[PDB]
């Protein structure tokens, strides 16, 4: 049946095996075969063993060529023939990987058919030049209201999501991806961000849940999941973000926009540590290899918004860094912080206090920031930044007889903090972010009891939806808030406040 | 198995080709692998320990590691100047620097080259860089004044001549 | 034809085997013909047996062993000329401004040896500046190293831009802004911005030359961008007699790049993960920063210290070289002052009585005492109340807040950015202003008459205008 | 440097020997004398295999050399200097190793390919010849290089046949086809 | 549908183990000899085309 189709395919291989250069393992220990042969081999070239193992050739030494095996050592033994495939690593790139969970090689680990994508293009290629870029100005809206306002994000830029282990770091990230469904539905292909999630060291059960959740929210059809799971070998892990980046290049080159979330480069680091140590290259600061800066930098400048002559496109990126004790002082965090252009630092205490998003507002910055912010949201949340600044100082005033101004700030601030809570795995529309924050700015929400903020929010949104979805759509489509709209909004809020 | 300096193929080739290079390796050497501001020279068998050698690059060096078959000179000079298989001639003297009276009002570098360039240095002699400390027996207690003009350092720190006193 | 075949490609450390007696010398530049154009390898060892060990500048990915290499014969020779001002240049001396082949006169080796003891500065000189804060509390000095601290953007880069404008007025000098570990997106903005503010005009004149060394460029090329830049500057200084001001970006990324190259070379990196040859690498670079008899280089460097640790050996080594430190404060920018400069944390060692002139010094000491007292007084004065000021203390507060406003002085480049045409203030006239303010000639003149103005002459005009 | 570069470790001795005797153009002589001393190594198995072990002194090592050159005076002269080198460097374990390396290097200089046709069975001489003919016919032999071809029996090669020579192989095996079958009929 | 998909997977891996039995049959047979002749001459033809 299906068996017959496979046998036919086997009949369809019979190719002349005149391997111009073969190799023989001299000794294989530690997944570091030292091969005799491979005279004309290119560096990092893909090699196929008798065991069928795939490798890269980091060391080209004069007497031996030190293959690093991608495969397991289990079948490998000394003397093994090493065919020289003669092709440096390449992975299929194209829109073929939309809704496809693939390993680095390109094998569909979800088995959603053999990947048919436009071309297979090599894993490593150097980052775009100065003149091949044009400055960011296009927002991207993550649905997370706080992210969109406090640290507004744009296109073809890097900005961290650096935070403490298992705080559902992936949950914060996943929320962005979900909101991209709304924009994805939208026609403009800059609004179609074809997300790439790079699950690094993440156990297959966890990624299966991720996949399932994505399927539940029907997100697998702009999503691409490059998977190097916990089991997946340190070469695969090492080349995994690079491989992923190339997939992104097809979109970027096609002028479209897309978002690649490298999660977490901290586990990428460990894999490089393993590799370096196995090649006995000295391990850098904090026993994390010395060229880790170089490695991360090579990857991270591929995230770029190309020039309009390069067909205004981008590969937005949002690297995730895991802070073991919360130490941004840790060598890999410090390096990465320097490399990137913004960081968002989730606060563990806030997470524990159930404030999800758990964002540490002070330790979150975006350098592009308000350049890539919706004008409407900019107007109604410049105020929010200043209010929160006061609220931070007046946080300690929560220890009481307080100045009336201080006590007012404390009330206004507490209501705001609750407003910026957004239950995990439920994005919000921008046209509904802007009215709510306006209310808070006008202090309408201050009066509303803290417990009734929640009831107020959903109700207000429906109230607005009923009363004037003409306004909401107008606000949405204009993307700006005119004095007439803000006027109407203050009034509308007053009407809602009465109920 | 092991790596020996004679295994260097050109050296190895001379030994095979009959033997050696006609006792030229007792007082001149020819440089082998070089870099890291140290050179490994073949020959110089009559090298005194801590001799000053002059390389043909002009660079002079102090023999540091006297090893069987090779000497590891330390280059008092920049790497670019030095090149492999260069002929090193023995100064024949342990590292000495000109010493005398006519260095008062002179800026010299460490080789005693007047970098004030107020002509050649008027130096009576040259004297070996390392010289042993005077023992207990040639020592004598201090009593001479050194006045610094700083009251604290001349009323809380008494300083006299021939002493050893840290300024930190 | 000195040629050799590649016999290893372990990392970016490529060992090349040359035929006998046809060996390059150390620091020579080798060019391997490639479909990458060339790969430039710089010979960093002789491993003997007619083989060498070299480092690469351009990436070695997909390199095939046994490929013939051609030896240039010496450290990379990069184009120089007045023509080359206004070119973004990569490490290998090729246009990355993409406005085509660099129009060049002469080309010159990237490595160069520091001038002799005689040709070092025998007596200090004070480079003119136009920022009053700079001209009082940390006057620029020819051959000096001035280490920037404080955020970029509205901070460092705008400050750097101002300096180019000022330098053009001051001498007619040139610059080369060398950016190491440069985020290419940010660099693009800076280039475009530099074009916009006309310090680069390629439809006009471009004073500053750009060398941008992105982080994605290999560590070897990161190390060599600086040496190249200094050579360009030196062509101006020595061979066009110019006085120039050469910006360097992060020396953390200078260190970082060098550290890797050492470790790759197998040299034990010293404590705090910093190369054993750390001292020498700064030493060669920052002893080529000097006032020669022909010209003088002066270098403004940006000193980004990792983790705020000045205890780290690389920052310490930098501080040894630093003659001044400019410590931009964001608090100051928030006090509506552009200058963003923190006056009390800005210090220079060339500020000494004789060095800056006795009058200048005495005025400076008074201004320091005034500011020092103003800050300290304001600490408990705010708490206690402003009416708890003594007559003397509120005289000082009155004067001080007038000085605080006097600090505000727009920058010429920031004519657009603040919206107010910059006020260039010459060093002598800065002293004059402060003498008068100290003598309270302007303590009967309003606070915001000093807001956003320049020298003594400027505040005569504004004193009248604020009222009228 | 003289043709055919060998990156042998302790084979650097062989390389050196080769270039040194190539420059004295006494390479055929060397090869022959090397064959003769190699033969006298095989024909000295007790304490010429069983005292290739490192326990010899300098003085005792030298006297082993002296006993060997008493056995024959057919020596290159350069290899008598090489014998001296090997005694002084106390190279004795890679002594036949150097001999083998010089032999390969030498007969490469002379030109002579090597080859083997590992199989799962000992093929016919008709097969040997037919394959040798075929190989010479193929542009692989371009002349100036001869051939050795030994079919060997190895149970390890399962399926097909494998031809090997000049680092160029055609490896027919069952295993690769089995592999493709297995993978797809489990997925 | 779930047991149907499972049964298809199960059938192919069962039939895979039946292929292993056929592999043992091929490597025993003097089809092993006759196909070695075919492979030999095929390599002669192929490699001559190089």
Coordinates of N, CA and C in Angstrom, one line a residue, chain D:
Chain D
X1 N 59.2 22.2 -1.9 CA 59.8 21.0 -1.3 C 59.5 19.8 -2.1
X2 N 60.3 18.7 -2.2 CA 60.1 17.5 -3.0 C 58.7 17.0 -3.0
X3 N 58.2 16.5 -4.1 CA 56.8 15.9 -4.3 C 56.2 15.1 -3.3
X4 N 54.9 15.2 -3.1 CA 54.1 14.4 -2.2 C 54.4 14.8 -0.8
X5 N 53.5 15.5 -0.1 CA 53.7 16.0 1.2 C 53.0 15.0 2.1
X6 N 53.7 14.5 3.1 CA 53.2 13.6 4.1 C 53.3 14.4 5.4
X7 N 52.2 14.4 6.1 CA 52.1 15.1 7.4 C 52.2 14.2 8.5
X8 N 52.9 13.0 8.3 CA 53.2 12.0 9.3 C 54.0 12.6 10.5
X9 N 53.6 12.2 11.7 CA 54.1 12.6 13.0 C 55.1 11.5 13.3
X10 N 56.4 11.8 13.3 CA 57.5 10.8 13.4 C 57.6 10.3 12.0
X11 N 56.8 10.7 11.0 CA 56.8 10.5 9.6 C 57.4 11.8 9.1
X12 N 57.7 12.8 9.9 CA 58.4 13.9 9.6 C 59.9 13.5 9.3
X13 N 60.3 12.4 10.0 CA 61.6 11.8 9.8 C 61.6 11.2 8.4
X14 N 60.5 10.6 8.0 CA 60.5 10.0 6.7 C 60.5 11.0 5.6
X15 N 59.7 12.1 5.8 CA 59.6 13.2 4.9 C 60.9 13.8 4.7
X16 N 61.7 14.1 5.8 CA 63.0 14.7 5.8 C 63.9 13.8 5.1
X17 N 63.9 12.5 5.4 CA 64.8 11.5 4.7 C 64.6 11.5 3.2
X18 N 63.3 11.5 2.8 CA 62.9 11.6 1.4 C 63.5 12.8 0.8
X19 N 63.2 14.0 1.3 CA 63.7 15.2 0.6 C 65.2 15.4 0.7
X20 N 65.9 14.8 1.7 CA 67.3 14.9 1.9 C 68.0 14.0 0.9
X21 N 67.4 12.8 0.6 CA 68.0 11.9 -0.3 C 67.6 12.1 -1.7
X22 N 66.5 12.9 -1.8 CA 66.0 13.3 -3.1 C 66.9 14.4 -3.7
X23 N 67.5 15.2 -2.7 CA 68.3 16.3 -3.1 C 69.7 15.8 -3.3
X24 N 70.0 14.6 -2.8 CA 71.3 13.9 -3.1 C 71.0 12.9 -4.2
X25 N 69.8 12.8 -4.7 CA 69.3 12.0 -5.8 C 69.8 10.6 -5.7
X26 N 69.6 10.0 -4.5 CA 70.0 8.7 -4.1 C 68.8 8.2 -3.4
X27 N 67.7 8.0 -4.1 CA 66.4 7.7 -3.6 C 66.1 6.3 -3.9
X28 N 66.4 5.8 -5.2 CA 66.3 4.4 -5.6 C 67.1 3.6 -4.7
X29 N 68.4 4.0 -4.5 CA 69.4 3.4 -3.6 C 68.9 3.3 -2.2
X30 N 68.3 4.4 -1.7 CA 67.7 4.5 -0.4 C 66.6 3.5 -0.3
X31 N 65.7 3.5 -1.2 CA 64.6 2.6 -1.2 C 65.0 1.1 -1.1
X32 N 66.0 0.8 -2.0 CA 66.6 -0.6 -2.0 C 67.2 -0.9 -0.7
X33 N 68.1 -0.1 -0.1 CA 68.7 -0.3 1.1 C 67.8 -0.4 2.3
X34 N 66.7 0.4 2.2 CA 65.6 0.4 3.1 C 64.9 -0.8 3.1
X35 N 64.6 -1.4 1.9 CA 64.1 -2.7 1.8 C 65.0 -3.7 2.4
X36 N 66.3 -3.6 2.3 CA 67.2 -4.6 2.8 C 67.3 -4.6 4.3
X37 N 67.3 -3.4 4.9 CA 67.3 -3.3 6.3 C 66.0 -3.7 6.9
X38 N 64.9 -3.4 6.1 CA 63.6 -3.8 6.5 C 63.4 -5.3 6.5
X39 N 64.1 -5.9 5.6 CA 64.1 -7.4 5.4 C 64.9 -7.9 6.6
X40 N 66.0 -7.3 7.0 CA 66.8 -7.7 8.1 C 66.1 -7.5 9.4
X41 N 65.2 -6.5 9.5 CA 64.3 -6.4 10.6 C 63.4 -7.5 10.7
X42 N 62.8 -8.0 9.6 CA 61.8 -9.1 9.6 C 62.6 -10.3 9.9
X43 N 63.8 -10.4 9.4 CA 64.6 -11.6 9.6 C 65.5 -11.4 10.8
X44 N 65.1 -10.5 11.7 CA 65.6 -10.4 13.0 C 64.4 -10.2 13.9
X45 N 63.8 -11.3 14.4 CA 62.5 -11.0 15.0 C 62.7 -11.1 16.5
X46 N 63.6 -11.9 17.0 CA 63.9 -12.0 18.4 C 64.9 -11.0 18.6
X47 N 64.5 -9.9 19.4 CA 65.3 -8.8 19.8 C 65.6 -7.9 18.7
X48 N 64.8 -8.1 17.6 CA 64.8 -7.1 16.5 C 63.4 -6.8 16.2
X49 N 62.5 -7.5 17.0 CA 61.1 -7.1 17.1 C 60.9 -7.0 18.6
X50 N 61.6 -8.0 19.3 CA 61.3 -8.1 20.7 C 62.4 -7.3 21.4
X51 N 63.1 -6.4 20.8 CA 63.9 -5.4 21.4 C 63.9 -4.3 20.5
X52 N 62.7 -4.0 20.0 CA 62.3 -2.7 19.5 C 61.7 -1.9 20.7
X53 N 61.7 -2.6 21.9 CA 61.0 -2.0 23.0 C 61.9 -1.0 23.7
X54 N 61.4 0.0 24.3 CA 62.3 1.1 24.8 C 62.8 0.8 26.2
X55 N 64.0 0.5 26.3 CA 64.7 0.0 27.5 C 66.1 0.1 27.2
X56 N 66.5 0.4 25.9 CA 67.9 0.5 25.5 C 68.4 1.8 25.9
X57 N 69.7 1.9 26.0 CA 70.4 3.1 26.7 C 70.6 3.9 25.5
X58 N 71.5 5.0 25.6 CA 72.1 5.6 24.4 C 73.2 4.6 23.9
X59 N 74.0 4.1 24.9 CA 75.2 3.4 24.5 C 74.7 2.0 24.0
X60 N 73.7 1.4 24.7 CA 73.2 0.2 24.3 C 72.4 0.3 23.0
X61 N 71.7 1.4 22.8 CA 71.0 1.6 21.5 C 71.9 1.7 20.3
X62 N 73.0 2.4 20.5 CA 74.1 2.6 19.5 C 74.6 1.3 19.1
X63 N 74.7 0.3 20.1 CA 75.3 -0.9 19.9 C 74.4 -1.9 19.1
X64 N 73.0 -1.6 19.3 CA 72.1 -2.3 18.4 C 72.2 -1.9 17.0
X65 N 72.5 -0.6 16.8 CA 72.7 -0.1 15.4 C 74.0 -0.7 14.8
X66 N 75.0 -0.9 15.6 CA 76.3 -1.4 15.2 C 76.1 -2.9 14.8
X67 N 75.3 -3.6 15.5 CA 75.1 -5.0 15.2 C 74.3 -5.2 13.9
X68 N 73.4 -4.3 13.7 CA 72.6 -4.3 12.4 C 73.4 -3.9 11.2
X69 N 74.4 -3.0 11.4 CA 75.2 -2.6 10.2 C 76.4 -3.6 10.0
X70 N 76.6 -4.5 11.0 CA 77.5 -5.6 10.9 C 76.8 -6.6 10.0
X71 N 75.5 -6.7 10.1 CA 74.7 -7.7 9.3 C 74.7 -7.4 7.9
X72 N 74.8 -6.1 7.5 CA 74.8 -5.8 6.1 C 75.4 -4.4 6.0
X73 N 76.1 -4.1 4.8 CA 76.7 -2.9 4.5 C 76.0 -2.2 3.4
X74 N 74.8 -2.8 3.0 CA 74.0 -2.2 2.0 C 73.1 -1.2 2.6
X75 N 73.6 0.1 2.7 CA 73.0 1.2 3.4 C 73.2 2.4 2.5
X76 N 72.2 3.3 2.4 CA 72.2 4.5 1.6 C 73.4 5.4 2.0
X77 N 73.7 5.5 3.3 CA 74.7 6.3 3.8 C 74.1 7.5 4.5
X78 N 72.9 7.9 3.9 CA 72.1 9.0 4.4 C 71.3 8.3 5.4
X79 N 70.8 7.0 5.2 CA 70.1 6.3 6.1 C 71.0 5.7 7.2
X80 N 72.3 5.8 7.1 CA 73.2 5.5 8.2 C 73.2 6.6 9.1
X81 N 73.0 7.8 8.6 CA 73.0 9.0 9.3 C 71.6 9.1 9.9
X82 N 70.6 8.6 9.2 CA 69.2 8.5 9.8 C 69.2 7.5 10.9
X83 N 70.0 6.4 10.8 CA 70.1 5.4 11.8 C 70.6 6.0 13.1
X84 N 71.6 6.8 12.9 CA 72.2 7.6 14.0 C 71.1 8.5 14.7
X85 N 70.3 9.2 13.8 CA 69.3 10.0 14.3 C 68.3 9.3 15.1
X86 N 67.8 8.1 14.6 CA 66.8 7.3 15.2 C 67.3 6.8 16.5
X87 N 68.6 6.4 16.6 CA 69.2 6.0 17.9 C 69.3 7.1 18.9
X88 N 69.7 8.3 18.4 CA 69.8 9.4 19.3 C 68.4 10.0 19.8
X89 N 67.4 10.0 18.9 CA 66.1 10.4 19.2 C 65.3 9.3 19.8
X90 N 65.9 8.1 19.8 CA 65.4 6.9 20.5 C 64.1 6.6 19.9
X91 N 64.0 6.7 18.6 CA 62.9 6.4 17.8 C 63.1 5.0 17.4
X92 N 62.2 4.1 17.9 CA 62.5 2.7 17.7 C 61.1 2.0 17.6
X93 N 60.0 2.6 18.0 CA 58.7 2.1 18.0 C 58.1 2.4 16.7
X94 N 58.4 3.7 16.2 CA 58.0 4.1 14.9 C 59.3 4.1 14.1
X95 N 59.8 2.8 13.9 CA 61.1 2.6 13.2 C 60.7 1.9 11.9
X96 N 59.9 0.8 12.0 CA 59.3 0.3 10.9 C 58.2 1.2 10.4
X97 N 57.7 2.1 11.2 CA 56.7 3.1 10.8 C 57.3 4.0 9.8
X98 N 58.6 4.5 10.1 CA 59.3 5.3 9.2 C 59.7 4.6 7.9
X99 N 60.0 3.3 8.0 CA 60.3 2.5 6.8 C 59.2 2.5 5.9
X100 N 58.0 2.2 6.4 CA 56.7 2.1 5.7 C 56.4 3.4 5.1
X101 N 56.6 4.5 5.8 CA 56.3 5.9 5.3 C 57.2 6.3 4.2
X102 N 58.5 6.0 4.3 CA 59.5 6.3 3.3 C 59.1 5.5 2.1
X103 N 58.7 4.2 2.3 CA 58.4 3.3 1.2 C 57.2 3.8 0.4
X104 N 56.2 4.3 1.1 CA 55.0 4.8 0.4 C 55.3 6.1 -0.3
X105 N 56.1 7.0 0.4 CA 56.5 8.3 -0.1 C 57.4 8.2 -1.3
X106 N 58.3 7.2 -1.3 CA 59.2 6.9 -2.3 C 58.5 6.4 -3.5
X107 N 57.6 5.3 -3.3 CA 57.0 4.7 -4.5 C 55.9 5.6 -5.0
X108 N 55.5 6.6 -4.2 CA 54.6 7.7 -4.7 C 55.4 8.6 -5.6
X109 N 56.7 8.9 -5.2 CA 57.6 9.7 -6.1 C 57.9 9.0 -7.4
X110 N 58.1 7.7 -7.3 CA 58.2 6.8 -8.5 C 56.9 6.8 -9.2
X111 N 55.7 6.8 -8.5 CA 54.4 6.7 -9.0 C 54.0 5.3 -8.9
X112 N 52.8 5.1 -8.3 CA 52.3 3.7 -8.1 C 51.1 4.0 -7.2
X113 N 49.9 3.7 -7.8 CA 48.7 3.8 -7.0 C 48.6 2.5 -6.2
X114 N 47.7 2.6 -5.2 CA 47.4 1.5 -4.3 C 46.0 1.3 -4.5
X115 N 45.4 0.3 -4.0 CA 44.0 0.1 -4.2 C 43.6 -1.2 -3.5
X116 N 42.3 -1.4 -3.3 CA 41.8 -2.5 -2.7 C 40.3 -2.5 -3.1
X117 N 39.7 -3.7 -3.3 CA 38.4 -4.0 -3.7 C 37.9 -4.8 -2.6
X118 N 37.5 -4.2 -1.5 CA 37.0 -4.9 -0.3 C 35.6 -5.4 -0.8
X119 N 35.3 -6.7 -0.4 CA 34.2 -7.3 -0.9 C 33.7 -8.2 0.2
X120 N 32.6 -8.9 0.0 CA 32.1 -9.9 1.0 C 32.6 -11.2 0.6
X121 N 33.4 -11.3 -0.4 CA 33.9 -12.6 -0.9 C 35.2 -12.4 -1.6
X122 N 36.0 -13.4 -1.9 CA 37.3 -13.3 -2.5 C 37.0 -13.4 -4.0
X123 N 37.1 -12.3 -4.8 CA 36.7 -12.3 -6.2 C 37.7 -13.0 -7.0
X124 N 37.3 -13.3 -8.3 CA 38.0 -14.1 -9.2 C 39.3 -13.3 -9.7
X125 N 40.3 -13.9 -10.3 CA 41.4 -13.2 -10.8 C 41.0 -12.5 -12.1
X126 N 40.0 -13.1 -12.7 CA 39.3 -12.6 -13.9 C 38.7 -11.3 -13.6
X127 N 38.0 -11.3 -12.4 CA 37.4 -10.1 -11.8 C 38.5 -9.1 -11.5
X128 N 39.6 -9.5 -10.8 CA 40.7 -8.6 -10.5 C 41.1 -7.9 -11.7
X129 N 41.4 -8.6 -12.8 CA 42.0 -8.2 -14.0 C 41.0 -7.3 -14.8
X130 N 39.7 -7.7 -14.8 CA 38.7 -7.0 -15.5 C 38.5 -5.7 -14.9
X131 N 38.5 -5.6 -13.5 CA 38.4 -4.4 -12.8 C 39.6 -3.5 -12.9
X132 N 40.8 -4.1 -12.9 CA 42.1 -3.4 -13.1 C 42.1 -2.8 -14.5
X133 N 41.7 -3.5 -15.5 CA 41.6 -3.0 -16.9 C 40.6 -1.9 -16.9
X134 N 39.4 -2.0 -16.3 CA 38.4 -1.0 -16.2 C 38.9 0.3 -15.6
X135 N 39.6 0.1 -14.5 CA 40.2 1.2 -13.7 C 41.3 2.0 -14.5
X136 N 42.1 1.3 -15.2 CA 43.1 1.9 -16.1 C 42.4 2.6 -17.2
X137 N 41.3 2.0 -17.8 CA 40.5 2.6 -18.8 C 39.9 3.9 -18.3
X138 N 39.4 3.9 -17.1 CA 38.8 5.1 -16.5 C 39.8 6.1 -16.3
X139 N 39.5 7.4 -16.5 CA 40.4 8.5 -16.4 C 41.1 8.7 -15.1
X140 N 40.7 7.8 -14.1 CA 41.3 7.8 -12.8 C 42.8 7.5 -12.9
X141 N 43.2 6.5 -13.8 CA 44.6 6.3 -14.1 C 44.8 7.2 -15.2
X142 N 45.8 8.2 -15.1 CA 46.1 9.1 -16.0 C 47.6 8.9 -16.4
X143 N 48.2 7.8 -15.9 CA 49.5 7.4 -16.2 C 50.5 8.2 -15.4
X144 N 51.6 7.6 -15.0 CA 52.6 8.2 -14.0 C 52.2 7.7 -12.6
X145 N 51.2 6.8 -12.6 CA 50.7 6.3 -11.4 C 50.3 4.9 -11.8
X146 N 50.7 3.9 -11.1 CA 50.5 2.5 -11.5 C 49.3 2.1 -10.6
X147 N 49.3 0.8 -10.1 CA 48.1 0.4 -9.3 C 48.5 -0.8 -8.6
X148 N 48.0 -1.0 -7.3 CA 48.0 -2.2 -6.6 C 46.5 -2.4 -6.4
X149 N 46.0 -3.6 -6.5 CA 44.6 -3.8 -6.3 C 44.5 -5.2 -5.6
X150 N 44.0 -5.2 -4.4 CA 43.9 -6.4 -3.6 C 42.4 -6.4 -3.3
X151 N 41.7 -7.5 -3.7 CA 40.3 -7.7 -3.3 C 40.5 -8.3 -2.0
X152 N 39.7 -7.9 -1.0 CA 39.8 -8.5 0.3 C 38.4 -8.8 0.7
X153 N 38.3 -9.8 1.6 CA 37.1 -10.4 2.1 C 36.9 -9.7 3.4
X154 N 35.7 -9.2 3.6 CA 35.4 -8.5 4.8 C 33.9 -8.9 5.0
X155 N 33.4 -9.5 6.0 CA 32.0 -9.8 6.2 C 31.3 -8.5 6.5
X156 N 32.0 -7.5 7.0 CA 31.4 -6.2 7.3 C 30.7 -5.5 6.2
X157 N 31.3 -5.6 4.9 CA 30.6 -5.1 3.8 C 29.5 -6.2 3.5
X158 N 28.3 -5.7 3.6 CA 27.1 -6.5 3.5 C 26.5 -5.8 2.3
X159 N 26.2 -6.6 1.3 CA 25.7 -6.1 0.0 C 26.8 -5.4 -0.8
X160 N 26.5 -5.3 -2.1 CA 27.3 -4.8 -3.1 C 28.8 -5.2 -3.0
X161 N 29.6 -4.3 -3.4 CA 31.0 -4.5 -3.6 C 31.5 -3.1 -3.3
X162 N 32.8 -2.9 -3.0 CA 33.3 -1.6 -2.8 C 34.6 -1.6 -3.4
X163 N 34.9 -0.6 -4.3 CA 36.1 -0.4 -5.0 C 36.6 0.8 -4.3
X164 N 38.0 0.8 -4.1 CA 38.6 1.9 -3.4 C 39.9 2.0 -4.1
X165 N 40.3 3.3 -4.3 CA 41.6 3.7 -4.8 C 41.6 5.1 -5.0
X166 N 42.7 5.8 -4.8 CA 42.9 7.2 -5.0 C 41.9 8.1 -4.2
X167 N 41.5 7.5 -3.1 CA 40.6 8.2 -2.1 C 39.2 8.3 -2.8
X168 N 38.9 7.4 -3.8 CA 37.8 7.5 -4.6 C 37.3 6.1 -4.5
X169 N 36.0 6.0 -4.2 CA 35.5 4.7 -3.8 C 34.2 4.8 -4.5
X170 N 33.6 3.5 -4.7 CA 32.2 3.4 -5.1 C 32.0 2.3 -4.1
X171 N 30.9 2.5 -3.2 CA 30.6 1.7 -2.1 C 29.2 1.3 -2.3
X172 N 29.0 0.0 -2.7 CA 27.7 -0.6 -2.8 C 27.6 -1.4 -1.6
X173 N 26.4 -1.3 -1.0 CA 26.2 -1.9 0.3 C 24.7 -2.1 0.2
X174 N 24.2 -2.9 1.1 CA 22.8 -3.3 1.2 C 22.3 -2.3 2.2
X175 N 23.1 -2.1 3.2 CA 22.7 -1.4 4.4 C 22.1 -0.1 4.2
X176 N 22.6 0.8 3.3 CA 22.0 2.1 3.0 C 20.6 1.9 2.4
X177 N 20.3 0.9 1.6 CA 19.0 0.7 1.1 C 18.1 0.2 2.1
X178 N 18.6 -0.7 3.0 CA 17.8 -1.2 4.2 C 17.5 0.0 5.0
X179 N 18.4 0.9 5.3 CA 18.2 2.1 6.1 C 17.0 2.9 5.6
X180 N 17.0 3.2 4.3 CA 15.9 4.0 3.8 C 14.6 3.3 3.9
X181 N 14.6 1.9 3.7 CA 13.4 1.1 3.9 C 12.9 1.2 5.3
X182 N 13.8 1.0 6.3 CA 13.4 0.9 7.7 C 12.8 2.2 8.1
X183 N 13.5 3.4 7.9 CA 13.0 4.6 8.3 C 11.6 5.0 7.9
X184 N 11.3 4.8 6.6 CA 10.0 5.1 6.0 C 8.9 4.1 6.3
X185 N 9.3 2.9 6.7 CA 8.3 1.9 7.0 C 8.1 1.8 8.5
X186 N 8.6 2.8 9.2 CA 8.4 3.0 10.6 C 7.9 4.4 10.7
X187 N 7.9 5.2 9.6 CA 7.4 6.5 9.5 C 7.1 6.8 8.1

